[PDB]
Symmetry: D5
Subunit: 131 residues, 10 copies
Amino acid sequence: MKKHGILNSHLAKILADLGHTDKIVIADAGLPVPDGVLKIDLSLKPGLPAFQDTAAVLAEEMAVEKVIAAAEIKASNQENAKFLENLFSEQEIEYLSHEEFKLLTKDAKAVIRTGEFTPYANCILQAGVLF
Amino acid sequence: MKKHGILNSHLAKILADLGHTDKIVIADAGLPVPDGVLKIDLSLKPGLPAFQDTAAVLAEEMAVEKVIAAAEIKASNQENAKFLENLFSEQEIEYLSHEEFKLLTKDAKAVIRTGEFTPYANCILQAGVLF
Amino acid sequence: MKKHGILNSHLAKILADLGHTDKIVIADAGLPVPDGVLKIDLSLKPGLPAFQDTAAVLAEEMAVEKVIAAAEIKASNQENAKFLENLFSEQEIEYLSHEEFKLLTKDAKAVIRTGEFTPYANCILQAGVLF
Amino acid sequence: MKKHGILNSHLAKILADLGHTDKIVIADAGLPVPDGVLKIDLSLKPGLPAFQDTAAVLAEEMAVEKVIAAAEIKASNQENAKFLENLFSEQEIEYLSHEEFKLLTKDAKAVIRTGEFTPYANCILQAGVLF
Amino acid sequence: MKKHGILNSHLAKILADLGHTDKIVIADAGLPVPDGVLKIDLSLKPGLPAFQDTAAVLAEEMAVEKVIAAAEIKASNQENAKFLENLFSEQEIEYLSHEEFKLLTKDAKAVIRTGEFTPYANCILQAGVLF
Amino acid sequence: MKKHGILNSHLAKILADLGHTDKIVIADAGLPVPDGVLKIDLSLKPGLPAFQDTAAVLAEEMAVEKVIAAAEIKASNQENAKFLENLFSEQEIEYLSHEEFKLLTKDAKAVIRTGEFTPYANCILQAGVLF
Amino acid sequence: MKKHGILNSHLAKILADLGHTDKIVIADAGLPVPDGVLKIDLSLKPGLPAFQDTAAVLAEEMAVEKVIAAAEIKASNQENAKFLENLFSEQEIEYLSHEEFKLLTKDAKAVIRTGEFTPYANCILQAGVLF
Amino acid sequence: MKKHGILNSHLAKILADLGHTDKIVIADAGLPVPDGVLKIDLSLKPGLPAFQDTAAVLAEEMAVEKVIAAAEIKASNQENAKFLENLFSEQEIEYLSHEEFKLLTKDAKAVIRTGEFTPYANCILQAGVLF
Amino acid sequence: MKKHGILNSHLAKILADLGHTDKIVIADAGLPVPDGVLKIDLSLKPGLPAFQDTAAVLAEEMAVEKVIAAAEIKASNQENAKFLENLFSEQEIEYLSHEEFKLLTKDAKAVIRTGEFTPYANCILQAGVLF
Amino acid sequence: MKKHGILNSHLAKILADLGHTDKIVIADAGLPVPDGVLKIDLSLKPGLPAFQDTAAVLAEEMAVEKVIAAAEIKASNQENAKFLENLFSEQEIEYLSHEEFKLLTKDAKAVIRTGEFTPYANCILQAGVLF
Ligand SMILES: O=P(O)(O)OC[C@H]1O[C@@H](O)[C@H](O)[C@@H]1O
Ligand SMILES: O=P(O)(O)OC[C@H]1O[C@@H](O)[C@H](O)[C@@H]1O
Ligand SMILES: O=P(O)(O)OC[C@H]1O[C@@H](O)[C@H](O)[C@@H]1O
Ligand SMILES: O=P(O)(O)OC[C@H]1O[C@@H](O)[C@H](O)[C@@H]1O
Ligand SMILES: O=P(O)(O)OC[C@H]1O[C@@H](O)[C@H](O)[C@@H]1O
Ligand SMILES: O=P(O)(O)OC[C@H]1O[C@@H](O)[C@H](O)[C@@H]1O
Ligand SMILES: O=P(O)(O)OC[C@H]1O[C@@H](O)[C@H](O)[C@@H]1O
Ligand SMILES: O=P(O)(O)OC[C@H]1O[C@@H](O)[C@H](O)[C@@H]1O
Ligand SMILES: O=P(O)(O)OC[C@H]1O[C@@H](O)[C@H](O)[C@@H]1O
Ligand SMILES: O=P(O)(O)OC[C@H]1O[C@@H](O)[C@H](O)[C@@H]1O
Ligand SMILES: [Cl-]
Ligand SMILES: [Cl-]
Ligand SMILES: [Cl-]
Ligand SMILES: [Cl-]
């Protein structure tokens, strides 16, 4: 068995190919996935896994230099919007309209679907560099 | 969005094709997957999701006529062994050696990998019929 | 076997992947299917299954936020036009020219072909969200 | 549009390739489909379409020299058993155990899944020759 | 064996998928086939089968609402030009320059190659509807 | 355009790869094609092309060192059985039971389906060598 | 074995599909092959096969309507430039800049690589018609 | 970028799927790779990377339960044979004849080719469990 | 461009993956290629390239430890048989019946077809090692 | 085994197809690979293999006419920048902004990933000609 790194095999393969600036998406159960974009669904039941738990695992296994979320999250989802701010303190956090957000997902290397059943609980993690 | 059934898209597709006697496997994080058998990895980190959480969702979404587990589970993993007895109290439960158990996994339509980090926490759910 | 949800295995796989705003098409036996769009043919013979029967099953298994249909249906197929208005009373129904309607089908995730032998008995169901 | 023959596009392609002695299967909603065998699912909901309706359409579009069914159908599903004897009065009908029947389905060119929710409502149609 | 419809298996599969306005091409032995368009070659030797024999079988098996040919056929291939007028007397026949004709073939679902060895012996059959 | 050789593009590709002893089959409209064997269907309508016309074209484009047919042809199809004898004078003609014949087709590089509607009008041509 | 036509199986397959105006490229060992264009490498070692040897064979097996080469060939490879002029006496020979010549190769059905080790020894053969 | 685990993307993907008892092969530059087994070539030039360098990295990123090598390694490559003994002090090391060793490679999930230019510098690492 | 090694790109790719004992076949224009074995056709016309020319280039680019040919070559094709003995004087040359030779080609990584038009002009080159 | 040329099998295959002006990229551990471009990862661990070692091997096995690197390399990575200037003194070296450099990698035939952990350690090698 693999000693270090993320446990999920599908995710490990995605992280392995990440280059500087590549993007991956963590989505709630409702976010549509653009055609041609790999979808890794971790959902089990409503609320499992949670957006927060998923983002937390990714944060410790991936080097993030920028996080992008939809502005609507600040109003419609205060708890998760705060979570992001807290978790990605040293990272640049950019906000866009949900509409522009969805356009950006087309360039993502993959979309990770969580069991999150709350509005605008989605974010794009942009890969940084280790040197 | 889909209104009924299991939330996970990968899993919904497998359940959709199940016919009477078809088998699927719920596995701990260390079980090897035979060549040619589809693997759906739901693991996020050690213990998440657990074997019990996963098995309970599946029992809720599919008609199970028989459950197969490795005898070594009773001795080495009492808690989970008892959970199974309770969960599938109405179904027939068969115990084989872990060796025979693995051979049987070759005929599975899929292996669902959980984040379970305890010995012999695996089982085969054999589809029953709705009429 | 799968306990809940739509019975058809092909349709279950399509519904499983539906995200907010994704579209599927229910069509009569003559609608042309754009290249690249998955075609699921349920027809057995003229009138079987009927447009009404198919639309009714989907309405109960999928969350629909909007229905799109061709204006011509109100002229050449009042029967089915009324059925649609009644079935989706709570949803927004938009009428476009049959020409524009066909253009939109290029963006569908699938086209479900029925055995309906009446003109303009086609509609686009746009997925809603469960939360 | 195609003027003659079976209306369903998937079935038309299968019939088009039929040679003398090739077999296709008409099955209830629970019959398991062997790996490697094409599955065409026409089901919409329980009982739709029915075994009888599907078998009748195929009987008129395909030349059948022999019909194979499971002996158990005469015991648990007399209704459909009589239908079959009547529909294929001119053809040779053979009864085998459900177990052997399933074995034979491995050699079929396709399995047509209906919405039939009654036991052993399955049959194998063996192609005849037009000259 | 299949009882009704066109005898050729490759062709049956194409007709099976035709929807209103879909196009197929019948071509002489020299017409170039655009990239991405399926080619079904029925030629055996020069003149076998002929454009006329092929066109007549197709007119018998598919509903044609419009026929498109190259204007150069009237001048250089009078016999075949007249055959078409007679065969599709009830349909609308449109003549374009051979140059425009070829561009149009890019949208065809298939090109049927015949053994015809005479100039501009090609046409596009546009599927009509059965209701 | 290709100056020499057989006109049919599908057949040209098959002849191009023939090595000493490789086999190809010419079949009537009813012969079943084993799985994994390429099928090139030239049929247009019953009796077109004819078994005789097809075999004749192949005879002049391919080096045949042996022909294999089913014994039943001699009795059930005297006209075509004589044709073969006449056409392949200098070639070794071996006869087998239709049953053994079908077993041999599994090793064929391809099956050429003609529009021949007569019993046992099938034969296997075994490639010779040009030096 | 195949009796007539070009000996090389790969090439026979390419010529088999040639339609009027289709293009193939004969190239020296350094010509780059556009992405998507089929490459058939016949080279064994420098100078074998020679550009002249390959062009001769093709001229004999293909109906050539036009020949295209880079003007630079007259300046740096007069020997091959003269050969080309004589070989295609009856056909149209067009000279373009090497830069435009390369853009044209993107439309070719294939690039045939020879062992030619001399500058600009490349040409495009445009297929003609046999009637 | 990925924070933890092996640096090589190809290898990370292979380790990600490892289950208990799965096997991978580290090989010298001459070891033949069985058909069907994935080959990951890391060699740059003779001796780079070295067998020792590669085995060390893997030992640090993979949970090794058993090591298998050919007895011939003790006779012709004592240096690497000793290295292996020390590196896997706590694990079981089994020696088989080079001939049997090769048969065992057919079951491997992958063969990692190094630049090692010394005889019998190959070994099979059998995955263990993390619990 | 590649500075060193064999010039042919197809062959370069095959040599690149050769491991100790892997085999490749050099064949005359008539040798049949077993299904599943890659065929690289270098023939241009009868006698070009010749068996000898091809074998010479391969011997210079590949480390061969053993050669295998049909016994019939010594009698029916004296010239090439002598060439073989001379070219591979250092290596072991084993002669088998042509029938047994053909069975061995099933294990070859590829069959290189030459334009050689003389009988039994075939041989298997078994890869050696560089250390 | 292959006697000459680059040792790595993956790279050998890429060099084999290089034509005049084709480009390949040597990259540090962080350079992102554009979708559609083949990635060959030779990294083992940070610093192995090094950028310099990889570039040296390639320069010896490929005819390079031009090198392209990011301008930022001269300032942020002086050591490797000097190495580059020294290794490719005969060739033309063009410096572009790193942003413009990345756009150019879209046209590369492949990206070779090294274990280099220093910034802007990337370059594009443009293939020259051997004659
Ligand atoms: O649900 P509303 O607010 O209507 O639209 C936003 C949602 O739709 C999808 O993009 C995501 O699931 C997001 O949460
Ligand atoms: O822990 P031991 O008994 O060594 O091996 C059994 C484990 O190995 C794998 O098959 C499963 O993960 C199972 O739990
Ligand atoms: O208005 P047109 O396209 O002529 O006829 C409409 C019918 O054609 C097809 O699109 C559908 O079957 C629809 O019912
Ligand atoms: O006899 P068993 O297999 O238990 O039950 C028969 C039913 O199981 C499936 O094969 C079919 O659905 C059939 O109707
Ligand atoms: O004969 P020309 O006018 O030169 O070219 C027209 C022919 O070329 C191909 O498009 C068709 O075969 C058509 O018949
Ligand atoms: O038609 P019968 O004589 O029953 O069986 C022989 C035929 O069945 C198929 O193999 C061929 O079409 C052959 O002509
Ligand atoms: O050799 P130079 O003149 O530099 O470039 C022309 C060559 O480059 C490639 O396009 C062809 O191989 C052609 O022969
Ligand atoms: O070098 P000899 O001893 O001849 O053969 C053993 C070698 O052949 C291949 O299996 C491996 O590369 C191993 O190192
Ligand atoms: O020519 P005969 O002796 O009949 O058969 C041997 C030939 O058949 C093929 O295997 C080879 O081409 C070989 O040269
Ligand atoms: O490190 P910065 O300057 O932020 O970005 C440049 C790096 O990002 C990637 O393109 C390469 O790895 C390069 O070294
Ligand atoms: Cl479902
Ligand atoms: Cl049909
Ligand atoms: Cl040919
Ligand atoms: Cl990892």
